[PDB]
Amino acid sequence: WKSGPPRTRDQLQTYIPYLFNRLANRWNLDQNRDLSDHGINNVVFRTLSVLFIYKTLTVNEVAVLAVTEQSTASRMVESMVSSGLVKRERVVGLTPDGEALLRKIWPIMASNYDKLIEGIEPDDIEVCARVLARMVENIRQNQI
Amino acid sequence: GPPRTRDQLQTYIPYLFNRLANRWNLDQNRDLSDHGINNVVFRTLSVLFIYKTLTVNEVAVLAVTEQSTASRMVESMVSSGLVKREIRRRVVGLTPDGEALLRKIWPIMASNYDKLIEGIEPDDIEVCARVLARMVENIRQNQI
């Protein structure tokens, strides 16, 4: 888009920053609504998810991988320790209750993901993910 | 079951579009701050550059902000000379000065976009955008 901003609706439909912003907003709103039933929010869920994958992380790494501000991540990790989902091993990990909670919330999350990908070929999903992953490599400030 | 491994997380589109949107928006706000602009004003200019007129609530959808934030920023943009109120409700239109400002500051965002798409082929950009646009159609609550 060297010569100028996207100018028509058809051009906007090809402008990836608009698309990932509109998507992230609606996905996160819907997810936060569903998570409210469990008394947690997106940041807590994303923290459970990345601790499930990595087992232990520092609070700084949680902030990066769960995509939240460092100050918000430290306060939320303390909240999650108080509520028995995370333990302090500055590295933290899941408690059994934290893993159980992730497991119990995943059916609804999987249903939301199924709706997200309706009408999209698996090969196109793979190309889209490869593109977005390289974009993350291009602009991330933290190399994790 | 949730993404369980690092490789799975690296291919998980909701993680990717959240991490991307966060860093892109933070960078954009930082780079625009020197020009007295924020994310919402810039994205409002950007979508009125396409549509010319929109209601405030439509601006909130397409510029991806809260309705209340959009209303306050639109009023600021009236004082900035960048939009004008029109006569169904809360209609605003881009002024020639608003168009000129967007064209003037665009090279900053074009630079950021060039960084974003480094190492990504045009055909893969096209596939990525088509996937994300269908995802928007699948989950959007507003039919704009």
From TrEMBL, chain B:
GO terms for molecular function: DNA binding; DNA-binding transcription factor activity. The keyword Ribonucleoprotein does not apply. InterPro entries: HTH_MarR-typ, MarR/SlyA-like, Tscrpt_reg_MarR-type_CS, WH-like_DNA-bd_sf, WH_DNA-bd_sf. GO terms for biological process: response to stress. Residues 6-137 form the HTH marR-type domain. Keywords: DNA-binding, Transcription, Transcription regulation. The keyword DNA-binding applies. It holds the Pfam family MarR_2. SUPFAM superfamilies: Winged helix' DNA-binding domain. PANTHER family: MARR-FAMILY TRANSCRIPTIONAL REGULATOR, TRANSCRIPTIONAL REGULATOR, MARR FAMILY. This is MarR family transcriptional regulator. It comes from Bradyrhizobium japonicum.
